[model samples]
Each structure stands twice: as structure tokens, then as C-alpha cells.
Target: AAQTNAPWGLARISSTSPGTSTYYYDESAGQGSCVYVIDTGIEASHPEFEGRAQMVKTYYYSSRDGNGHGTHCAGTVGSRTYGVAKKTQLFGVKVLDDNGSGQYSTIIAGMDFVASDKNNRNCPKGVVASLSLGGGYSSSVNSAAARLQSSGVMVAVAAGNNNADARNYSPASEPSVCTVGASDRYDRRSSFSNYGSVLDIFGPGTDILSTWIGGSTRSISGTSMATPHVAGLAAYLMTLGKTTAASACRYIADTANKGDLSNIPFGTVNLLAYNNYQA
Candidate 1:
């Protein structure tokens, strides 16, 4: 299990992609961790997952993945192609419909299910749930995330693509969850990213390329895209024994590059995330 030194995210994110993926996976950095993508559902048989991804549940249609949003995000979280934690088990928790939208109750119910049955997925230490959808802020959703956090499930939510203050969004504004914004290849904040003191960190989301439905690849941009980087990285951290949700958040913030955010607003300049890991 030698390190490859060519992970796609590393280079696009201004880091060594393959090298980090290889090193972390070989070192069992996220061995005991699992990643759950709560979105429009994923193509479990997609080749990028290395036969490791599973569609644990679906709330929309029986066909699953009328849209590829969940598949793309899932790859960034744990697939060998565009992922941060290549070896971490990835699961799909479909909440959104084929149109990439869903009811708040649907999303909340999915989260509640994951939190309640985390062990059934073979994630005894914990699970990192990557939520790439957003809507009006919900205290109930925030509370559900907190309950999961207390139970060893870390939720990483996108800071919305509205380019507005993140405080107005649910889950993203949650003080307990790891809310992530988006950045580009050059370490600049994405123009469409929502930002504020409420963001936990930022990650490469601009034109991010990853696995899509039907075993294809697609490029998309948004904080939704950025959140998976943090989620995958959190899984990597968990492999190193930092399993708590709070500690995972702290590890990402503490390890991110704090010096290069030209596009971020003055107040949120320090909230950008950086995946600076190397072999």
C-alpha cells in the first residue's frame, strides 16, 4: 500500500493529491471512519468508489440518482478519484429529489436515521456526514446535528452558494456542526460562497471535478462541493484516532492554511480552509 502522490484534490486544491491520499490511506488515517453523503443519492456501483461505496438508504425515487449531485459529492468525500479519504467507507443517504431539492423534513429524517444507526454501517468510532444542500435555517436540524455530534457522528454542511452571510442558513449556521465555505485552486474564496464568522472552514469547490452518475465525471462549483473536502479530511483525521466531532472540526481549522485568502471578505478572511497535508 505505497502512497501514489497523485490525488486529484491535492493538486486542484494546491496540495499533493495522490501523495496525501496514499499516505493517509496507507497509514490508516481514516480506517475506523465512515463518510455519509446526504443528498440526491449516489450510484453505488460507480467505478471510482473502488467497490466500497454503498447506498444505505433512499428517500426520493426507487431508481435513485435522478441527478448526480450526491454521486459527485460522494466521490470527493471518499472515492479514490477525487476524494480526501480514499479508504474510508462511503454511504449515500438520499434526501433530495431528482431535481436536487428536498423537504427539510426529509433531510432531517435522513440525518436522524444515520445518527441512530451509525453502527449498522460498520462505523463504530463515528461517521462524517457530508451535507451539500441548504435552505432556511432550522433549529430542529441544528439540534439533530448536535445530537449526532454527541453520539460520535460529525456533520459537515455546506455554507450555501448564495454568497450571503452563512448565519442565515440552517445546519450551516449551526454552532456545533462544521460549516464549510468554498475556495478555488489559487486559495481564493469562491465568489458564490456564503461566508461569515459562522463558517467552520473552507475548501476547494470551484469547478471541482468528481464522479457523477452512470460512471461518468462532472465538474460543479459551490459550497456543497467544498463541504466534502472537509468531510473526507475529517475521516482522515479520525483514522489517526481524533474521533470526536468537535476535535475533527478543530483539526481542520488548525491545519488549514491561514495566510492566503485574497477573495474572502475582511471579517471572514480567516475562515478559509486549506488542505495542506503532504506525505
Candidate 2:
């Protein structure tokens, strides 16, 4: 079901303490923390984003939401209904095209540019980039992500949907970015999700309902669908002064409700949680 209220993804992480309710739906919720969706373009004209989401074409400028993946991911990241940080302004950095495809170099270039680009929204707190696509490894992309993280940019990348160890992939394998894996509604690691020590966390990714192209909504499942949840939370954490990639990732890893997940490989994987928000 398409949740007009808080979606399950957000509900899964919402803090219920006194005086913290206002942060969920208000304009100041995001506190100017911008999240750049580095995938296919977002549906800029989609009603969910009418006033909150903006578009920035780093590439594939001609087709907005031509594949709908980025749009759906964007919704889960910051739409009023489907987002974790509803009020966060979104930017679409199109690295992939309508075919949902991009070269390794193109992805790296778009990522580096967005992290440093100040012509658009000036996120004084910080900016978070959610990359839901992963494939061949590129040292350049890894270094680019490293540089951005060092400069206090939060980068959240998908841990691939191949069901293999994520350390075998590109941005997912990059130690700097917050690598995420897909978990089902029951908090089980998705059968198709890549895992291993490389994954920092897992998020809701099965049958996730979010904004789509043509002003519609759809339920999709993949690590791609999971990355943005952490990405959205990174924005909130950034506003809380966890602007650096290390700080934001550490905060998430530190505060996550560990019991929410099962079948973990190690001592703790920090299944994404919202245990903060007290004022």
C-alpha cells in the first residue's frame, strides 16, 4: 500500500520520545541537508517533489525518470510520504540513462562533481549522495568517494544485488562510503542481496512503495531500494552535526537498534534504526 502518512521505512526508524514528533513532517526537518540521487534522473515534476525536490543533470540530461528507478529511490529518500527525511531537498544527478545504464567513469565523474558543485543548493551542513547502482570496480571512483568523505560529504552506496560478497564490487567495496544491503520486511537479509563484512548496514528493501514516474507509485525490491533509506538518515544525522562521512556512518552504526535484525554474520551489523531524536 502507498502510505500517505509515514511509510514503514520511516516508521521503522522514528523516535517516539517527547517533543520529537515535529521533526518528522515539518519544513525544518531536513535543515537544508541536501541528498543527491546519483542514478537515473528523478521525476522532477512528480507531485511528491513539486516544491521539495530539485533536478541537476550531471549527465543523461534529456531523460528524466526514463527508467523510474531513480525516481522511486528518490521518493524513499525524501518524499513527504515515503521518505525517511521528508523535508530534505533532493537533487537528481543523472549518471545512468533511460536504459538504466552508465559507464564506470561516468558514475565517478558525476559523483566527484556533485560533491564539489556549489552552483545549486548550498548545503552548509553537508550533502549526501545515494548511489543505488554498482558494478565494475574503479580506483578513480573509490578515490573520488574518499575525497568527498574526507571533505565531509556523506556517500551511501548500494552493496549490489548479486547475492555475492559486497567487497567484490565498486562503490560498495569502497571503505569510505556507507555501503548498504537489502533486508526484507522481516529483517532477513534479502536472498539476492550481496553481503559480507563490507556492508555497514541493512535497510528495508522488499516491496517498498515509493514515488514513480508519471506521478504514480510502485513497490520495488533490491539493494538499490535500500541505499536511499540510509542516505536519507544520513541527511538527518548531518543536520545533527554528523556532517563527515565517517561521523554520519559512525552515528548510524552506533545508534542502530541491533535487535531489529537476525541472521547476521558478525557481532553486529546495525540494522538501520532511529534511536536518536529527543528534542
Candidate 3:
């Protein structure tokens, strides 16, 4: 796939609406939808997300928001009209704590729960899992994600906000997984986003407006912020046609803008192309 570069996140949203019924209007809307977010356990009561999405019932590990990074990311993935994939179900898997740090064991446990376990009465089927958190990717990490992908679960991770080659990132570099980078609001690569041939695709990550922990909303930045956009898009693609990671991944690569983005000066991931493919 394609990876757009963005250093510091600066995406934002003005006065608009996160329309709930918008998915019904999408040209490609169809049956079958699911997404699992491995971030901060949502401030479930946040008004912007009130009744907008839900967490899975069976959580192997849980993490809370401290810097509100997870909350912001969580909101973007499923908040009302602000989100891209509507009508898709979501799972809230908090693997990291408020300190922005987590152990590999927790991540492994979460992966195991999704791969070997099923979403019972209070959870989802775990079609695809999105992790916007940052960390080192190791051999085990690669194996785990590959396993998840082989199990019919798509594992999407951020390529990191640092301006480095994608090979240095852990989860992002994991095989059988998708790596996302940051782009501005204009489909141009954010100058700070990581880039390399390994990049899967660039999605919205800067100046993104989403739910806040305080029952409000705000704009934040980071590749972490971009992961959900891809995740949401993944849900939409899954709902529309293909559910396997390979199929969804092919859609992203086959549809991304191949022309020169040197003059885009905005966000990455061609929204026009994305809309067309989704439609």
C-alpha cells in the first residue's frame, strides 16, 4: 500500500455534523460490519459518542485515557457523522494504560482473546482490530499479528509519528498487517508522517476533530490518530464487499492516488479516490 508522511498532526474539523444516518446514503453500503479498537477504554459516557458505538463484552485487557489520546482516537473511529464507517459494529479493547505505555503480554492477551475467543453476549465477533498506540515491534509481534490476520482478523497499526523508515516500527512492520501514515486535511502527506515502501496506506491523522473525555470535542495529531481513519475505512470496505485483510488491502492499494502528491500540501490518502472506491 501507500504511506504518506506527516510529522506533527494538525488536522481539524470545523462546524459540521457527524451524521448518524449517513451510511445509509453510501453507495456501497451492505451487510456485515465489525471493528475492534485496541486503545483506551472509551469514556463511555462522552456525549459526542453517546449511543454512537459500543465496546466488546469480552475484554482480555483494559486501558484508560490519561492524555486523552485514546479517547480522541476512539471517538474518531465511531463518533456520529464525524466517522467514515457507519452501521459497523466496534470493540473497545484498552491495552495500554493512561501513561501511554503497555506490556507486550497485554497486547498478546488481547490478540489471543480475539483470535481464539468469540465475542459472547456482550462483545463483537472481532472482524478486524485497530491499534493506534505506539510501541516496539518484535519477532513475536510479527508472528502474533500474522496469526490474527490468518484467523480472518485484520490487524491495523500506526506507522508511528516519528520520521523514520517503516522497518524500524514494530507492529506497523508486522507482516500480514496494514501500516497507516498521517495526512493533512487536504490529502497531502503531513511532512512528519513516516514513509517507506512498507507503508500500506495513508489515512487522515492530522487536525482530526473527535470526542473528548470531557463530554466535548477537540483536534489532535499523530499517526495514532490516523489509524482509526483507516480502521473505519476498513469497516466500510468490509461492509461493502471484501472482509479478508488481503481483499480490503487490495482495495486500498488499487484505489489510492498514484499521481504525484508533491503539490498536495494537505493530507494523504486520496479522499476522492477513497470516496469513489467506497461508493
C-alpha TM-score for every candidate: 0.90, 0.88, 0.78
Residue 36 of model 2 has an lDDT of: 89
Q: Candidate 3, 248: how far from true, in Å?
A: 0.7
Tens digit of per-residue lDDT, candidate 3, span 1-279? 111221222112110111111222253321256667777666666655546456553233443444476667766666654555544555666767766667877777777777765444232323667888656657777677778777777677888877766677777787468888777655567667776666777776767777777677777778887887777666666665544555666676676545424433233333212434321
lDDT of 1 by residue, 188-265 (tens): 788999998888788888888889888999888889888998898888777766546668888778776675666777
lDDT of 1: 0.78
- CA lDDT of every candidate: 0.78, 0.77, 0.61
Largest lDDT belongs to which candidate? 1
Candidate number achieving the greatest TM-score relative to the actual structure: 1
- What ordering of candidates by lDDT runs from best to worst? 1, 2, 3
lDDT per residue for candidate 2 within 1-279, as digits (tens), equals: 122345555655563221122224333456678888988888888888758787776576584678899999999888877787777889888899888999888987887788667445678767888999988777777787777677667888899988888877888888877888877756677778888887888777777889999899998899999899899988877776644556787778777766566566664364665536543
Q: Candidate 2 — what's its lDDT?
A: 0.77
Candidate 3 Cα deviation (angstroms), residue 3: 27
Clash number for each model: 9, 0, 25
Q: What is residue 123's positional error in candidate 1, in angstroms?
A: 2.0
User: Which residues of candidate 1, in runs, are more than 4 Å off?
Assistant: 1-8, 12-29, 269-278
